[PDB]
Amino acid sequence: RHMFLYNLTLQRATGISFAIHGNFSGTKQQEIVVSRGKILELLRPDPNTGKVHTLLTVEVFGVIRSLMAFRLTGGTKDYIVVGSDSGRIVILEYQPSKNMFEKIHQETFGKSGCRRIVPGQFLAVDPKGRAVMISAIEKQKLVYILNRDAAARLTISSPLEAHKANTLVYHVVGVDVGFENPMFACLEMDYEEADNDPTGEAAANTQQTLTFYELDLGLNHVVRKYSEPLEEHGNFLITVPGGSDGPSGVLICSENYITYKNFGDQPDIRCPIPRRRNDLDDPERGMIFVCSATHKTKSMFFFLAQTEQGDIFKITLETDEDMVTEIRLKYFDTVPVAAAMCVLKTGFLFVASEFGNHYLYQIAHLGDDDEEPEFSSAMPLEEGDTFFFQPRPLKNLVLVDELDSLSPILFCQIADLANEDTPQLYVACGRGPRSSLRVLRHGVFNQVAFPLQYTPRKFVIHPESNNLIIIETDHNAYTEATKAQRKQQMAEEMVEARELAAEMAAAFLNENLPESIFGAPKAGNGQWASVIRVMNPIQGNTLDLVQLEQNEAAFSVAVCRFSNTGEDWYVLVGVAKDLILNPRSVAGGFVYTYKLVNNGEKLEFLHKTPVEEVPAAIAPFQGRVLIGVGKLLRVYDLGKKKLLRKCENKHIANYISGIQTIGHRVIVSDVQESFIWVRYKRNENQLIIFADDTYPRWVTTASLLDYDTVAGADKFGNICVVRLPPNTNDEVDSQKAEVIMNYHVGETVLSLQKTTLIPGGSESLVYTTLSGGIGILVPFTSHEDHDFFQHVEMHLRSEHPPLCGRDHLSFRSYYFPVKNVIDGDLCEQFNSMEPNKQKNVSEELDRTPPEVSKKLEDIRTRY
Amino acid sequence: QSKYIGTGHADTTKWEWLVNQHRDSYCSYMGHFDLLNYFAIAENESKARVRFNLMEKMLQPCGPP
Amino acid sequence: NLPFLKPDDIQYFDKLLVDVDESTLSPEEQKERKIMKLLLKIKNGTPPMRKAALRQITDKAREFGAGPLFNQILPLLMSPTLEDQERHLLVKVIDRILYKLDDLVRPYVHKILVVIEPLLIDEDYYARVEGREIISNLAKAAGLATMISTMRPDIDNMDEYVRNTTARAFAVVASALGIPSLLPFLKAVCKSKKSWQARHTGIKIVQQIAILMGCAILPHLRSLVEIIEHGLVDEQQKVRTISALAIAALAEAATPYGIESFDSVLKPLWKGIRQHRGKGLAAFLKAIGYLIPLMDAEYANYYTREVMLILIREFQSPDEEMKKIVLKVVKQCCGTDGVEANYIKTEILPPFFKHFWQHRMALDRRNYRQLVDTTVELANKVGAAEIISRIVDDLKDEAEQYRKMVMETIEKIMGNLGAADIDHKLEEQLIDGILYAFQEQTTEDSVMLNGFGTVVNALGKRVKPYLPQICGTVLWRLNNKSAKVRQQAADLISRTAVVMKTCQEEKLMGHLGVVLYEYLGEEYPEVLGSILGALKAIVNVIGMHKMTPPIKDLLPRLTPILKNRHEKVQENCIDLVGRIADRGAEYVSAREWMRICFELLELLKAHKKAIRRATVNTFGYIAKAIGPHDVLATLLNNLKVQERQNRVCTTVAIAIVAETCSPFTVLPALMNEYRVPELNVQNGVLKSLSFLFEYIGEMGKDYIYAVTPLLEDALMDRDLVHRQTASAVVQHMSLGVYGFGCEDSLNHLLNYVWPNVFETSPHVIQAVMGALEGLRVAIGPCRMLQYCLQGLFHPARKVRDVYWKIYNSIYIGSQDALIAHYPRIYNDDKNTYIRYELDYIL
Amino acid sequence: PDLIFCRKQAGVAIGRLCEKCDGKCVICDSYVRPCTLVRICDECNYGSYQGRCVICGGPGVSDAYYCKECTIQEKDRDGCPKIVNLGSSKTDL
Ligand SMILES: CC(=O)O[C@@H](C)/C=C\C(=O)N[C@@H]1C[C@H](C)[C@H](C/C=C(C)/C=C/[C@@H]2CC(C)=CC(=O)O2)O[C@@H]1C
Ligand SMILES: [Zn+2]
Ligand SMILES: [Zn+2]
Ligand SMILES: [Zn+2]
């Protein structure tokens, strides 16, 4: 009856949100600290072999919102400052002897959560390590002063308030003022006037401001010294070296521009961001940067700025007499869009992609010698004219290591398609051209990747042929036909308005940029690209493919049979037309009925069925299909020219996102309200709602554990288990389910499946993670083990508290109080404690530390 | 408790409450990595582009009074 | 109105008493009047008066002028009857007005400093802090050049005291405006040919800059050293001394980083070591001692071998300051990597122990502490036995203070290192010296007790051959006219009990216990508590079964001691009773346990926290020893008969019974006492339930359903304070069962707690709000959000007031969570209200 | 009604408590479960107020603690918890 679950991560998250480089070992070697989400990891790149090694990984049980490194004066090792979702700021030091993160300081200032006015989102440190600053997106900002004592141990002071009401923050970064009073540049915007202007004038008249906060050490207080508006709204900042090397001023990245600005008489030197020659992207779309990097040397310094299209440019500042007159930008080769870049000494570059696998490149030539053009802020240009660039393959950099990342996982099916005993995980993940379907085995996980055209959304398995039917849909994208058409149009107006341009256009047409590395053609608010694909699991082959129109977007797919027509199979795909996300507006949808012949290898188009809204869910149902179109749940039967409805329920709350059937109980998932239990009364052909939930939930996936119990996942990283009352009549309505399980994983789950991973063994509930992780929930066998693990949880919650000041019980109950789940990821940290703590906790548990270790390992064997 | 932005009184209007709620939502989106990831997968834009669009929307998200 | 005035205030606030009119008074006079009123409101006034007066005096600081402001402030800052808080109010208002009048204070800078500089040498730490703060605010207000021009002529003033004061103030302004801003002025003054006093004052400025800033100097350490290095070879001797002291202070501030900055100071100091003598030699030695810990291992070895000859020579100096300096230098040398241990053992130890370890050095306390700490730091690197062997024989000296010194040294050494480094002969020397020192102490000293205990515990099982002698000494000491010696003997027993048990001398320890037994009739309370603690230790080491006297005879002897008043006696007796109740409860009848229980119940309202803690532990042990029935019944009776105070102890006892014994035992009868209609006992039962749940915490996850009917009765208007206490019960329930699947019963209780949200009594509405917050953290903010959304927008203004109070509590409690719980509010003709982002589907 | 919480931003100063208010919780006056350590602002721990009790204002003997119930509700995250009297000056006894 009672469901008691135990949570264990099998494959940790692989996506990266933040990355920093520094001398964390305290030696001449450089390491990289990365934030996977709720996990903090340390990596050591070997300059000899050119490969990245993982040295330490720690579950912090929180949300890392900002990460940075700093070093004191004359120090020989960099510390790690972490901005978390607790009301606390933490400073840590890595000790290589114990291979642990030693929490050196932890100071409290506010409440927990990713709050609006509580600092944590932004972190900025003074380049000399004298002080650090934590900041929220609104109003509040705090500054801490760092120093050392007699024993050379880091010390932190009380906070210094630097708040300013009705103010937003786009980014904060510390200015290298040498050894003057430390200063922090902030991108802000005041909304007080926009809120009180009922006409909308003040909304557009308000402009982004760059402000400077100075920290008077002698007077020991923070003050807003200067604040200058900017014509162009900027996304983030870059600190350029100051004092002995370079001027102090900041660099602002904006839409289509990059500006150097400095306090004092320094004029603003702004240079337009280069574009691309004959860009396939929409002309109306702007262009911004996504990340930056800084590399200093005894001689010169430079910057690396990447654009939305993955173009990395090298930026050098030409300064004359404590004044900068020129900003120079040169094309560096192109890599996938990253979230952070790290230029290391010993000549290597780390690219942590926002989605997909990560890369470690080796530098070969910095780009000074080659003939490729160079662009400066002083070159004359008409206002509309911009610089123009043509991308080329990697010449300056060479790939020396590729690190596999399963982020972002959008679908997973666990099954033994390859005739084996242990099943495999079939994972549709990746994004855009970098999408991939991967087969994962174990015997740590082992992966095999097959590339895909567009972002996979759903995939089904054909029972007879064991072949996958995948749908790949992307927004703001072109299809093959429209790509070729637009390329031909650009060539046609290239000829008009010499006549070597005909040869140049022929060269442009005969050149097809690999969309994987140079990006996919991105153009359009409501333009969609959709592809149906058939693929064999064993080999990376694609048996067949179908392309759909430029405004047709697939969101549902199913392989089924019909009683109307024998044992021949059929494939139904749900498509939307003219879907606008924000604000929402859709013309209608279509249901593609395909016959699928040649024992699961080729799709034969049968017919297209118009429908009022997007078909978001399609599930077979005893010789018929159950299709969800908006708030309408219909049962459809195969016709000769159309899909004809037999019964329809209209009273669904908002929008059907998924339906699963057990017997004659259908479990509709709604986007905001959760789980509606409807009953198909065979007699009379009526769909009657008999149950729903008392809580709203943003359902992503679902899974049925029995005839009365359902397991679901939130968009907000939650998992729940809801079960119906035992005495329930499907003809009596207003029955409400009880929530028997609630848990917060810290990551968003998009696939839940009940399975037995090891032949033999035991059942479990495996979930996937949008940030690229795999976890399992295992039920308990005896309640004495339940009490044991609950006491382990209680003791580790107070003796090994989370690394970033979060309360574990508070964290795991982020949106709903925890109910009947044990955190095994926390329990397994028993072996990462100190000997005295392990001894005392084991004595409290009335057994030995090795006994507790074996008891923990037995569950990692029973999975 | 009036200084805490987002709290309301008996004279709080629908617009004030919903603007505070939308702004809180946007801040939470930018804090929670997987929410921003879902958003950036929906719209084929980079994470930084989504963040910039969100911060742009924070001026008057629900619209003028 | 006008605040109160102390007598000394009259002299400064005479004019405010007379009644006049504004227009009669001259414009210059008006300023004086408003400044007087504002400063009186600041000095003697409530925090709101002070805040208002501060804002008013800052917003018009420019309008007033620095003249009258300071000509009235400075007289107040010189009153001999000035409280420290008054000084703090004055320094705060000075900083606030100085931030406003930037250059408007340059005329009065001098007139300020002459009143402020004497604070930089006050014995009070906070006075010096405030003085530094005002000088910093002034140097930021007035220009740097203004400060220099105001304080320049005093550099070569004849009085050395004035020079020191001006140098300290210059250091403060350097910390206020930055080192590089004063770097050229200091570089010039440190080479001033016009006066040796000028260079002396400049090097003093650098020294005080070091002393004040510390580790924030490593930046400009190179600059300061290059500025002051020439002062070591100057013709004048006092400037050489002050340059050595400044180098020493810079090295102390730079520990441990930045040895390379002192690269051009090594050979001058090394030459002056051989050349100079007296105070200058002491300053040179101090500089070298503070500089060595920053060097590399090999170079530290080289420099240490270079200077060790003169160090060992100056070991035998008559100047006590020289002795202290060379001792600190030895401590610094032998605590660094590079100075090998055998080198110290061969070349440094014999003269150290021949010259320093003399009788007269044990008289002065400063030399005492310095020598003790230095010898311990020596043992940390050269070996414990090499140190103890040279001073162990001195444990039998006539001078008691010398024995105390060597005892403290041996104690600290063996506590930091242990006893693995010791052989047999040294162990025998140790035992003999410790026995003689403990046997011949005129004054009861903690040093002897601590040293004995530390040596015994460090030897461990190696002390068995001496245990009969030690116990004979302890027995002979327990028979003495003085009490404090008996207390010391009992404390020694307490500290050595565990090592005795390791040595398996159970008959000796049983003899100790039976000897302590008859000593329970002791009259002096401190020694009685000591022997009680000793009995507790012995009872712990030798089990309850073999303990002599047997528990059945020991505990009744302990029973009347609970009536004693001394806190030490009460604590030790309660701890011993608790030990007996934990492990040896079978040897005592339930009657004696009940009598102790009811003599112990009063001590729950003791003032000392340790006594209440021990009482709780002991009560819980005896309540687990007996069944809960008897104690429960008599506690319920005591609850009925007693009212208000002394019933809190009965409620605490009921809760302790509920925690030890399962609440299955206590809850039914406790709720049946609520069945009778006597409203006072209903209040008592409700208070008992509140504390019971608050105490048992997560233990009450299985009793919400059981208490639910009593609550839903009490939530109805049975009285009013019944509603208050029932809300308190629900609050503690929710906070205790947080995260244990109790959402159903608590959700049910929420429906009966909610209608009481429309109540006017402040105490009961506060209790209802607390209950709602606890239910929020136990159920989740979503259900609360629905309950609140019902009436967030309502025609009735009172409904909106209450519901927005609720919503504010929830929103502050968990604003981030509510992101997932707000309903869909569809946009209308004007606005765009739907969150289109959350409607996305992949 | 004359006594209020400081509620300023707390710093590195550790709260302190006298012999009478030893095991009490600064917020709710509870003895049950001392959980987290109390921090106070720099202004409340300056001068003669160094080592002074947070509730009444007497000679401190033991560190101050929030209780488990307040920690769970994050009442430790609020401002400086030192009680201040709005009807007395700095020199009043
Ligand atoms: C560490 C701790 O306290 O643990 C708790 C669980 C134990 C006990 C507890 O709370 N016990 C509580 C706490 C408190 C001690 C309480 C109040 C008693 C007072 C104010 C007595 C005041 C009188 C007033 C006058 C004029 C003179 C005088 O001598 O004292 O009593 C009650 C029994
Ligand atoms: Zn007190
Ligand atoms: Zn305070
Ligand atoms: Zn409390």
Swiss-Prot record, chain A:
Which segments carry the region annotation Interaction with PHF5A, SF3B1 and SF3B5? Answer: 107-121, 147-170
Phosphoserine PTM positions read S158
Interaction with SF3B1 and SF3B5 as annotated region, ranges: 195-233
| Compartments it resides in | Nucleus
Site, as annotated: Interaction with SF3B5:
G286, E308, E354, R431
Self-association state and partner proteins as the record states: Component of the 17S U2 SnRNP complex, a ribonucleoprotein complex that contains small nuclear RNA (snRNA) U2 and a number of specific proteins. Part of the SF3B subcomplex of the 17S U2 SnRNP complex. SF3B associates with the splicing subcomplex SF3A and a 12S RNA unit to form the U2 small nuclear ribonucleoproteins complex (U2 snRNP). Within the SF3B subcomplex, interacts directly with SF3B1 (via HEAT domain), SF3B5 and PHF5A. Identified in the spliceosome A complex; remains associated with the spliceosome throughout the splicing process. Component of the spliceosome B complex.
Q: What does this protein do?
A: Component of the 17S U2 SnRNP complex of the spliceosome, a large ribonucleoprotein complex that removes introns from transcribed pre-mRNAs. The 17S U2 SnRNP complex (1) directly participates in early spliceosome assembly and (2) mediates recognition of the intron branch site during pre-mRNA splicing by promoting the selection of the pre-mRNA branch-site adenosine, the nucleophile for the first step of splicing.
The free-text domain remark for this protein reads: The core of the protein consists of three beta-propeller domains.
Homology family: Belongs to the RSE1 family.
Q: What is this protein called?
A: Splicing factor 3B subunit 3
Q: Which organism is it from?
A: Mus musculus
Curated annotation (Swiss-Prot), chain B:
Q: Does the keyword Acetylation apply?
A: yes
- Location of site Interaction with RNA? G6
Q: Among its keywords, does the record have RNA-binding?
A: yes
What's a GO cellular component annotated to this UniProt protein? U2 snRNP
Q: Where in the cell is it found?
A: Nucleus
Q: Which UniProt keywords apply?
A: Acetylation, mRNA processing, mRNA splicing, Nucleus, Phosphoprotein, RNA-binding, Spliceosome
Query: Which stretches does the entry tag as region Interaction with SF3B1 and SF3B3?
Result: 1-62
One example GO MF annotation: RNA binding
Please list the residues that carry the modification N6-acetyllysine: K3
A GO biological process of this protein is: mRNA splicing, via spliceosome
Assembly behavior: Component of the 17S U2 SnRNP complex, a ribonucleoprotein complex that contains small nuclear RNA (snRNA) U2 and a number of specific proteins. Part of the SF3B subcomplex of the 17S U2 SnRNP complex. SF3B associates with the splicing subcomplex SF3A and a 12S RNA unit to form the U2 small nuclear ribonucleoproteins complex (U2 snRNP). Within the SF3B subcomplex, interacts directly with SF3B1 (via HEAT domain) and SF3B3. Component of the minor spliceosome, which splices U12-type introns.
Q: Belongs to which family? A: Belongs to the SF3B5 family.
UniProt function note: Component of the 17S U2 SnRNP complex of the spliceosome, a large ribonucleoprotein complex that removes introns from transcribed pre-mRNAs. The 17S U2 SnRNP complex (1) directly participates in early spliceosome assembly and (2) mediates recognition of the intron branch site during pre-mRNA splicing by promoting the selection of the pre-mRNA branch-site adenosine, the nucleophile for the first step of splicing.
Designated name of the protein? Splicing factor 3B subunit 5
- Species name for this entry? Homo sapiens (Human)
| Top-level taxonomy | Eukaryota, Metazoa, Chordata, Craniata, Vertebrata
Q: Which gene codes for it?
A: SF3B5
| Whole-protein residues included | 15 to 79 of 86
Curated annotation (Swiss-Prot), chain C:
Give the UniProt keywords, A-Z: Acetylation, Citrullination, Isopeptide bond, mRNA processing, mRNA splicing, Nucleus, Phosphoprotein, Repeat, RNA-binding, Spliceosome, Ubl conjugation
Q: Region (Interaction with SF3B3 and SF3B5) spans which residues? A: 786-842
Q: Give site residues, Interaction with RNA.
A: P7, Y125, C573, Y587, L679
Give the subcellular location: Nucleus; Nucleus speckle
N6-acetyllysine modifications at? K92, K100
Instruction: Report residue spans for region: Interaction with PHF5A.
Output: 85-88, 694-695
Q: Where is this region: Interaction with SF3B14?
A: 67-106
Q: Name one GO biological process term.
A: chromatin remodeling
Cite the repeat ranges for HEAT.
67-106, 107-141, 142-179, 181-215, 218-256, 301-339, 381-419, 548-586, 590-628, 660-698, 701-739
> Modified after translation how?
Phosphorylated. Phosphorylation occurs concomitantly with the splicing catalytic steps.
Q: Into which family does the record put it?
A: Belongs to the SF3B1 family.
Which purpose does this protein serve, as stated in its record? Component of the 17S U2 SnRNP complex of the spliceosome, a large ribonucleoprotein complex that removes introns from transcribed pre-mRNAs. The 17S U2 SnRNP complex (1) directly participates in early spliceosome assembly and (2) mediates recognition of the intron branch site during pre-mRNA splicing by promoting the selection of the pre-mRNA branch-site adenosine, the nucleophile for the first step of splicing.
- Recorded protein name is Splicing factor 3B subunit 1
| Organism (species) | Homo sapiens
| Biological classification of the source | Eukaryota, Metazoa, Chordata, Craniata, Vertebrata
**Which span of the entire protein is present here?**
463 to 1304 of 1304
From Swiss-Prot, chain D:
Q: What terms describe the molecular function in GO for this protein?
A: DNA binding; RNA binding; zinc ion binding
Task: Provide the binding site for Zn(2+) 2.
Answer: C18, C21, C53, C56
Which UniProt key words apply to this protein? Acetylation, Activator, DNA-binding, Metal-binding, mRNA processing, mRNA splicing, Nucleus, Phosphoprotein, RNA-binding, Spliceosome, Transcription, Transcription regulation, Zinc
What's the reported outcome of changing Y31 to E/S/A? Alters the structure of the presumed branchpoint (BP) adenosine binding pocket within the splicing factor SF3B complex which may lead to decreased binding affinity and thus affect pre-mRNA splicing
Superkingdom of origin organism = Eukaryota
Q: Can you supply one Gene Ontology CC term for this chain's record? A: nuclear speck
**For binding Zn(2+) 3, which residues are annotated in this chain's numbering?**
C25, C28, C67, C70
Q: Which cysteines are joined by disulfide bonds?
A: none
Which compartments is it annotated to reside in?
A: Nucleus; Nucleus speckle
One GO process term, biological-process aspect: mRNA splicing, via spliceosome
- Asked if the Swiss-Prot or TrEMBL record annotates the protein with the keyword Transmembrane helix, the reply is no
Residues modified as Phosphoserine are S89
This protein's record includes keyword Transport: no
Instruction: Describe the effect of Y31C.
Output: No apparent effect on cell growth, localization of SF3B1 protein or formation of nuclear speckles
User: Oligomeric state and partners?
Assistant: Component of the 17S U2 SnRNP complex, a ribonucleoprotein complex that contains small nuclear RNA (snRNA) U2 and a number of specific proteins. Part of the SF3B subcomplex of the 17S U2 SnRNP complex. SF3B associates with the splicing subcomplex SF3A and a 12S RNA unit to form the U2 small nuclear ribonucleoproteins complex (U2 snRNP). Within the SF3B complex interacts directly with SF3B1 and SF3B3. Component of the minor spliceosome, which splices U12-type introns. Within this complex, interacts with CRIPT. Interacts (via N-terminus) with U2AF1 and SRSF5; acts to bridge the two.
Species per Swiss-Prot/TrEMBL record:
Homo sapiens (Human)
